[model samples]
Target: MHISSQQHEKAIKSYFDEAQTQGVIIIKEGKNLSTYGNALARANKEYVPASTFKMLNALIGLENHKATTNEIFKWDGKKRTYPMWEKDMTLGEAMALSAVPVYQELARRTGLELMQKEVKRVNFGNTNIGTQVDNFWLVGPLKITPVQEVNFADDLAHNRLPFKLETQEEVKKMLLIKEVNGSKIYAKSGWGMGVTPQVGWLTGWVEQANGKKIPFSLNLEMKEGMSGSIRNEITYKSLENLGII
Candidate 1:
């Protein structure tokens, strides 16, 4: 799946025009690939990485043998004291549901030091283990670029990194989102506040046939007080327009 430079330029321009995005980048097999808007906007800087960080969390859990898809952590239905619900969940189910408490517990059990090591191993984005899995890390400090994201996705697809092969395979398989026949998409969406005080994110990836891949990553943000839903819609529309569904 080789995308020509002309094709990339046109697609990127279309993405920017349709999404009104702040910044975007698309990559395939470790390349610069395509881009739109301000690729380097101070306001569009990296943020907490939202639930996307869960991939790393899952990796950490798996590598440490702290958790696995088959293992079930029953939800006692005890209302969490920390602003969320109480529910039992399996490690795999928690990832699928993006349950905060489940992930928090996983992080807690894995401990910060191990989580940090796993995060650095993947090198997905600007992740700080000390702050990321920690309570004080706030919400949007880990930063990432679309290029970095797509690179990570490609790495995951090709088993190019050093980690538990079975675990990486499991994480990748869990994220596989099927919206079309014979076309599978695996992705994670990150939504949170950044230094710009606006909602920010990293999202987009398509697993193509024949072992090739297309992945897009972006940081769509606005002023601190603006609604994040609009940015989310913008990103969605951008993908939809690109025939990504």
Candidate 2:
């Protein structure tokens, strides 16, 4: 079923009104699906991609044949490791678990030059993967706007990026992780501390049904001390309303 402009507007407005969302951008069929909140708030605004950048890093690793899905990595039983330990992990499992160290390792392997080049090619926010293996490039400090994300999503759907078609397909397939009622939805969620010292993020996606596709991206900049449960609840509610759960 084609999603009409009116329907898109209604769904978007309903989300904003119900969730009190600060801003939102919904894209469908390669176009601006719908928008609400201070559209101005969304314009020219950038937020730390948080873990969302993991998808990009995963793409790089897969394209280079440096990672796989079923591979396993050792945990070392430590809360945090400064130097980070190397463990076996597949491109697929890392994505499913949002494993930080595995992706960090991939960044280390990709190095600064290659990472930056791909970031530019994909037109992602700012590519800072060159600073240090464990730097913000892989984890935090990356900035991107809603428009940029929409552009990337469209590129992914149309196979217009730099990576091989098969590699891109593998990455997208991993991101789409779950399916329901025959509709395939792909998404990534992120969280991090920023200038205002709050939890910020970019989470949304490309949803396909009956061979038709819709791209929807959502961003959130929460209060400085908002609870994780609150954010998760809000996100679930929004997806539920969209029949994306």
Candidate 3:
């Protein structure tokens, strides 16, 4: 069956209202799917992948042996906007830092032909990268809906994606956010800083103490004066309120 919304709105309603966000949250555990907000319709609306694409980019790079978890990319000595990106780092480090330049270089090395092929193999969104290899996900032509993000993330979390198990595992290690009360939360946050009312994303899964995994994805319109961390704050609160963690 497909994902159904409003199964757990108690938390999402309070959090979304408190945060003044306009978006959706999708959580799936086996056949039980729960969503919040106007998820049935809003979750299908597409938006730029932004840094969230790093998850797939890393998977494609590893599956093709274009990048390894330990392989380091040297810093170009150019100034970076984020302090975490100021040094040379491995694929895992780059992922944790959400370093765009590192992933962009990896994509350049992975090349368009293979990237497009692998992206299509995963059946992510429309699987279109346009003509640019580096900025497609950040700018345009590589859009994904909140539902698609959650579905793709669910596939990865369960090692059910088309990529090799080892490749998927390596990417999974990169997404681990934190462990609380023996449950681990793994997610990636994205900011479409280039757009008006910038879009923000937090997508990944929760690995419960019993080894059961609940994959979740959230996206919100970043209203004026809103910072990116609000995405994580709201998502975590919702998860807590729903007793999913």
Candidate 4:
């Protein structure tokens, strides 16, 4: 199904007022949410998907049985910037922690040819794997618009992301971060520490009480003083205003 992403001025206005940094927030029940900060324009512009690629990474992992949602990825004893990522973690736990290395390992396991094929099969981002391995959506050569991100999330919620229905649901199940009143929110956050100014992304779908979903994407430059938590804060606060849950 094609979705029309309508612009919500209030959502954008409130964000600019509080966040200081400029970024767009798109919450699509059937379309995109528009805000006042030239959001629609930026939304159409493509940037690296960064860690957000993990959503698809997990999808590919489960699809090929290279890894299972419950299977654990052993930490190679390398010290990471994040404590939670230094130890072994199951797929679900790795996703929750936004462990870059774990998913990177999964990507390597998926292989360049299959990964490139699946990336094209779903028409994801630029469909370029960048040097075919280490460089991926994480930084160089791969890019996608926030609007494209919203579209991808929506497709998955509807079981249309080129994977089996059960596979989609399995990945979605692994992504649920918070829930209340029977409505669940499934999301993954992607940050690019490699970029000069740093690109931060938080994108996912919200399943409301009616069983329908709201797909969204938020991306912006991660300025020096901004905490990583701002990624979720923007998403949660905006959805709350939209009464999305």
TM-score ranking of the models: 3, 4, 2, 1
Q: Which candidate is the best by TM-score?
A: 3
Number of clashing pairs, model 4?
5
Q: Highest lDDT among the candidates is held by which one?
A: 3
For model 4, the stretches where C-alpha displacement exceeds 4 angstroms are: 1-8, 31-38
Indicate the TM-score of model 1: 0.74
Candidate 4 clash pair list: 4-31, 5-31, 5-32, 7-34, 8-34
Regarding TM-score, does 1 or 2 come out ahead?
2
Please tell me which model should have the higher lDDT, number 1 or number 2. 2
Q: How far does residue 211 in candidate 2 sit from its true spot (Å)?
A: 0.9
Stretches of candidate 1 off by over 4 Å are 1-21, 29-32, 37-44, 76-86, 136-141, 193-196, 202-204, 222-245
- Report the alpha-carbon TM-score of model 3 versus the true structure: 0.93
Quickly count the clashes in candidate 2.
Answer: 8
Q: Candidate 3 residues 1-245, lDDT tens each? A: 24333445655777777887787888887866667853446688888989999999998888888877888899999899987789999988888888999999999999988888888888898789888998989878888998899998889899999888898898999999888899999999998886665888999999999999899999888766887778888888878867887
RMSD (CA, Å), candidate 3 to true, equals 3.3
Where does model 3 exceed 4 Å of error? 1-8, 38-40
The global Cα lDDT (0 to 1) of model 2 is 0.62
Q: Could you give the candidate ranking by lDDT, starting with the highest? A: 3, 4, 2, 1
Candidates' TM-scores? Answer: 0.74, 0.77, 0.93, 0.90
